[PDB]
Amino acid sequence: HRKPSLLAHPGRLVKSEETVILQCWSDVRFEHFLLHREGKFKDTLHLIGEHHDGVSKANFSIGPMMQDLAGTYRCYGSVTHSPYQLSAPSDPLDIVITGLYEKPSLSAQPGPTVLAGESVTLSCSSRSSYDMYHLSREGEAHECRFSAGPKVNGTFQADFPLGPATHGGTYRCFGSFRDSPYEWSNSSDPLLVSVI
C-alpha cells in the first residue's frame, strides 16, 4: 500500500483538444497503476507501470482533450501476485479544459503598475452569465477562484484582491458555471502586474 503522487508536467489546465500527461510515481515497487476520473463520464485507465530507475511510475496520456476528459483524477497501483489489490487512494487532481467560451476582461483597478506595499486588485468582467471567475498566476499548483456579482449595467465580474503589491507577475482569468465546474472559458489576455 501507500498513496503515490499524481501531477501533470505541463499543468492542470489544458487547452481545447490539447493533451496532458498524468504521471503516477511511487517508491513502492508496484507493477500496475489505475487512473480514475469523476464528473460526467466516470472512467478508469489500465496502464502497466514501468520502473524508470529507483521509483516505480506510469504515464497516462489524456489525448484530444474534451469536455468528458475533464474532471477529478485519482491514481492507484499494485502487484499482480494478487490482481484485484489496490493501493490507498492518491491525491485528487482536477484536469480542466480551458478554451470553450468568450474570453473575460481582466484588469487592475489601481493600475497594472503600482508602487510596492500598495494593495493591487484585478477583476473579471464579461457580458455572459459566468457564475465564477478564476485567476491563474501560471506556475503554482493550486490557484484561486470566486463566484460573481450580478449584472451592474451589462457586466458580470469577480474581484481578486491580491493585496500589498510585493513580487508581482502575470495573471490570467477564466469563467465558469455552477453546472460544469471543470469546463472553463477561453483564457483572457495576459497581463503583467508590475511592482517598482
Domain ranges, ordered by start, for the chain: 1-98, 99-196
Closest CA to 137 of 68, 193, 178, 64: 193
1-98 and 99-196 share one fold? yes
Count Cα neighbours of 111 within 13 Å in the Cβ-side half-sphere. 8
CB 40 within 8 A of CB 85: no
CB 99 within 8 A of CB 176: no
Q: Which residue has the cell 482536477?
A: 94
Cα separations in angstroms, 133 against 96, 171, 183, 184: 14, 12, 12, 9
Closest CA to 145 of 12, 2, 7, 56: 12
If one looks up domain 1-98 in CATH, what number appears?
A: 2.60.40.10
CATH for 99-196, options being 3.40.50.980, 2.40.37.10, 3.40.50.300, 2.60.40.10: 2.60.40.10
What is the resolution in angstroms? 2.9
C-alpha cell at 37: 476520473
105 bridge partner residues: 125
In whole angstroms, give the CA distance from residue 111 to residue 122: 9
DSSP state of 177: -
In whole angstroms, give the CA distance from residue 54 to residue 142: 28
CB 65 within 8 A of CB 16: yes
